Design a protein around this ligand. Structure first.
Ligand SMILES: N[C@@H](Cc1c[nH]c2ccccc12)C(=O)NCC(=O)O
Ligand SMILES: N[C@@H](Cc1c[nH]c2ccccc12)C(=O)NCC(=O)O
Ligand SMILES: [Zn+2]
Ligand SMILES: [Zn+2]
Ligand SMILES: [Zn+2]
Ligand SMILES: [Zn+2]
Lengths: 413, 413
C-alpha cells in the first residue's frame, strides 16, 4: 500500500546491485553477505550474478538472533579469536579476486545484552584476522558494495510511527528503493546523473588542494590537516581490473582522508551510531596532535573507548566526508540508526583506516608509502556523523585564506 | 484449524531435537545444518542448545534456490572439487567433537534439469572430501540427528491437493510433530516407550543371528546374506562419550547391514526416491554374487546408473532395515519423497556404506576390518524402499531353516 510493485522493484533493485553496484563480469566470483531474513532478495541477487556470467556466488549468511545468543552464552574463548577456517574462506575469496556485496539489514541494537569486553575482544580479533580483505577492498583491488535491505527489527526502530510491523518494513524498503533510484524509469542514467553532480563538487575540491579544514558547530571546533596531493572522491570507484563500481548504495557524500597526524580540537556526534550492535549516543571526541586523547558517549561510553584504545590505528581519522544538510536523505528527517544511511544524511568522520585512493596514486602505494603520505593505517574504519543545519566549514588555503565551504550546513561561498 | 498452537509446538519440537535428539551437554559444540527458510526453527534450536550449556552452535545455512543456480550456471571446475576452506570447517567441527543436527526441508526435485554429469561430479567430490565427518558419524563418535522441517516446495509436492500453500505446509508440520511425539504430554517418556518396543524386536533378531534374509513380493525375490555377529539397531544410539542420542527423528525401523558379498535375486522399489535433488521413480535392481548387475528406473534411470557404476562400493549394499507396514507413517497413506520419512514407512536397503555399528565392536574397527567383516565401504549411502503390504520375508538360519519374519508386511510371529 505505501510502496508500489514490491516484487518487481525488489527484482529491479537486486539487478542494480549486481549490474551497477558490484558490476559482475563473466568469470567473476561474487561473495554476498546477507541476513537469512532476506532470502527473497538473496535469490534475486544470486540469479542476476549468474545471468551476468559469474562463475561462482558464495553466500555468507548472517543472522542477528543467532549471533546475539553466541555473544550472550559462548565463553570468551569462542569470542576472542577467529578460527582458521574463517580465515581460509577469506583467502579463497581473495585468491579468486571475489567482489564483495554486503547487504546490511541488521538490528541496530542487535547486541544490547552483551558484555562490553566480549564485544571488544571479538571486534579486535576480527579486525586483525580480516586485515587482508580490508586492505584489498580499501584499495579497490576487487569491486565491493555496501547496500541495505529492510530488516524487521531495524524497520521497527526507524519507523515508530508505522501502523504495523509490516508497514514499517514497507516504509524502509521505500527509502532503500527511493534512494537507490530504483523507481526511476532508467536507474542507471539516474545514477550517472547523480555521480556526475557529486563528481563536479569533488573535482572542484581537488583543484583547491586546501591545507586543512576547520569545522565549527555547537558541539564542535576541530581543525584537520589535509594530505599533500589528496583526492576527494564520491559515488563511483574503479577496481584494479579497470571495472567501474559503486562502493555505497545509496550515497550522497564527497570525501577524502585527513592527514592522520594533524587534528586538533573537539567534535560532537550529531546522529546516533550503531557500533558492535549497540546504539551509541552523544559521542564527544578530543584530538591533540592528530590523536584522540579522549572519547566519551552519553550512551555506549565503554564500547567507544574500547574501539579507540584497543585497535591498531584507531586513535586517528581515516576519512572526512561532506554531505549538505538540504540533501534528500537528510531532508527526509528520518534517523536510520544505520551507518550507510545516516552517513549519507550528514558530514561524517571515520575512526581508523583511510581509503588508499584518497591520495594521488594511492592505489599503488605500499602500506609504508600510504602512512608516509598521511593516510591512517588501521584495522577498523568506523564512521560517525557530525553534520547539522548549523555547521560551518572553511577550507584553509596555503596563503592563510579561509574559504567558506559550508555555512549553516550547506555549500556556500 | 489444521495446526493449532503452531509456535508452541515448534518450540517444543526444537527442545526435543536438542535435548533428546542430539542431547546437548555443557561444553559441547553443536553443528546445525538447516535451510534459511527455517530461520524461525533455527532460532529456537540455537536458543535451547545454549540453554543446555553448549559453548558454541555453528549454523551451516542451506538454500535450494541458490544451490540450483550454482549447478545450473557454474562451470564444472567449481563443481567437481571441494575448496580447502570447506574441508577446514569440517575439521574444526571434528576437532571440537561437534554434534551434527541436520534438519532437512529440501525440495525433493530441487535440482531437476541440472546436467547429470555435474550432479555426479559434485556428489563424488563431496563424498570424498567429507569422508572424515561421515566416518565419525557412521561410528557414533559424536551424537548426530537427522530430522525434518516443513519446507514450502517440499510440502507442495507431498500434498499436491492442498487447498493453499499454507495448508500444505501445515499438513507437513503436523506429520513432523505427530511422528516426533511433540503432541504427547510427555514426549520423552513417549520416545522411551517407543524405543522400548523397537528394541525388543532388535533384541529378538540379534538373538536369532540369521545367516540371511529372503524377501518376496510382486516384482521381488531377493536373498541377502548377513554378516557373522551382526547387530540390529533401532531408535536410540550411544555415542563415543557414553551419551544417549536419537540418530533419526522420526524413526520406526530396526536395521542392520547385510554381508556385502552375498546378494542374489531382484527387487522392485515401492516408493520414489529423492537423490541428488532429483525424483527417481520405478526403481528395479538385480543382484548376483553380492553385486548389482542391473539397475533401472522409469524416471531417473541415468542418475541411478551413475550412482551405482561411477562410485566405488556402490554395486553393493550397506543396510537392510525392517519397518512394519501397519506402522503409523506407512498407514498415513502419504508419500513424502523424502528419505527420512519414506524410510520410516517401508523396509529399505542402502546402496553403499554400512554403519560401522552394524557389527559387534565395529565402532573400533579399521576400514580393513569392517570390510573383512562383510560391511561395505563406500563414499555413498543411498536408501531405497522396497516394503509393502504384500511382502513376506523369511529369516534363514545357519542350518538353512526358513523362519517366517514378515508376512504381508508385518511381523510374522
Ligand atoms: N565514504 C564511504 C565509502 C566509500 C569508500 N570509497 C568510496 C568511493 C565512493 C563512494 C563511497 C566510498 C565509507 O567509508 N563508508 C561507507 C560504508 O559504510 O562503506
Ligand atoms: N537407519 C538410518 C540411520 C541410523 C543409524 N543409526 C540409527 C539408529 C536408529 C535409527 C536409525 C539409525 C539410515 O541409515 N538412514 C536414515 C537417515 O536418513 O540418516
Ligand atoms: Zn563516507
Ligand atoms: Zn567511511
Ligand atoms: Zn534405515
Ligand atoms: Zn539408510
Amino acid at each position: 500500500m505505501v510502496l508500489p510493485n514490491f516484487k518487481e522493484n525488489l527484482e529491479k533493485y537486486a539487478k542494480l546491485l549486481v549490474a551497477n553496484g558490484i558490476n559482475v563480469q563473466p568469470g567473476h566470483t561474487l561473495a554476498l553477505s546477507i541476513d537469512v531474513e532476506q532470502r527473497e532478495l538473496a535469490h534475486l541477487i544470486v540469479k542476476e550474478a549468474y545471468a551476468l556470467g559469474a562463475h561462482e556466488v558464495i553466500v555468507q549468511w548472517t543472522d542477528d538472533v543467532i549471533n546475539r545468543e553466541k555473544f550472550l552464552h559462548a565463553p570468551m574463548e569462542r569470542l576472542d579469536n577467529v578460527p582458521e577456517y574463517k580465515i581460509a574462506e577469506m583467502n579463497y575469496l581473495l585468491e579468486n579476486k571475489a567482489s564483495r556485496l554486503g547487504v546490511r539489514s541488521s538490528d541496530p541494537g542487535a547486541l544490547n545484552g552483551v558484555d562490553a569486553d566480549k564485544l571488544s575482544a571479538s571486534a579486535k580479533a576480527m579486525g586483525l584476522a580480516m586485515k587482508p580483505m580490508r586492505i584489498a577492498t580499501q584499495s579497490n583491488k576487487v569491486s565491493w558494495t555496501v547496500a541495505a535491505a529492510a530488516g524487521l527489527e531495524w524497520a521497527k526502530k526507524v519507523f515508530p510511527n508505522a501502523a504495523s510491523d509490516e508497514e514499517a518494513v514497507d516504509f524502509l524498503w521505500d527509502q532503500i528503493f527511493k534512494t537507490c533510484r530504483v523507481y526511476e524509469a532508467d536507474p542507471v542514467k539516474a545514477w550517472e546523473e547523480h555521480a556526475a553532480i557529486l563528481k563536479s563538487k569533488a573535482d572542484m575540491l581537488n583543484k583547491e588542494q586546501f591545507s586543512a579544514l576547520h569545522y565549527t558547530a555547537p558541539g564542535t571546533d576541530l581543525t584537520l590537516g589535509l594530505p599533500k596531493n589528496h583526492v576527494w572522491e564520491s559515488a563511483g570507484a574503479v577496481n584494479a581490473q579497470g571495472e567501474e563500481f559503486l562502493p555505497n548504495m545509496p550515497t550522497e557524500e564527497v570525501f577524502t582522508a585527513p592527514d592522520f597526524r594533524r587534528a586538533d580540537g573537539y567534535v560532537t556526534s550529531t546522529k546516533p551510531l550503531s557500533y558492535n550492535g549497540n546504539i551509541i549516543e552523544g559521542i564527544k571526541v578530543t584530538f591533540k596532535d592528530g590523536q584522540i586523547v579522549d572519547i566519551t558517549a552519553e550512551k555506549g561510553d565503554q564500547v567507544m573507548k574500547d574501539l579507540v584504545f584497543e585497535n591498531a590505528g584507531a586513535r586517528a581519522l581515516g576519512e572526512c566526508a561532506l554531505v549538505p544538510d538540504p540533501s534528500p536523505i537528510s531532508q527526509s528527517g528520518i534517523t536510520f540508526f544505520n551507518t550507510l544511511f545516516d552517513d549519507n544524511a550528514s558530514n561524517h568522520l571515520a575512526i581508523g583506516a583511510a581509503y588508499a585512493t584518497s591520495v594521488v596514486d594511492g592505489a599503488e602505494m605500499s602500506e609504508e608509502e600510504l602512512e608516509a603520505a598521511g593516510l591512517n593505517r588501521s584495522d577498523v574504519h568506523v564512521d560517525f556523523m557530525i553534520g547539522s543545519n548549523q555547521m560551518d566549514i572553511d577550507g584553509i588555503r596555503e596563503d592563510g585564506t579561509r574559504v567558506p565551504l559550508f555555512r549553516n550546513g550547506n555549500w556556500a561561498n
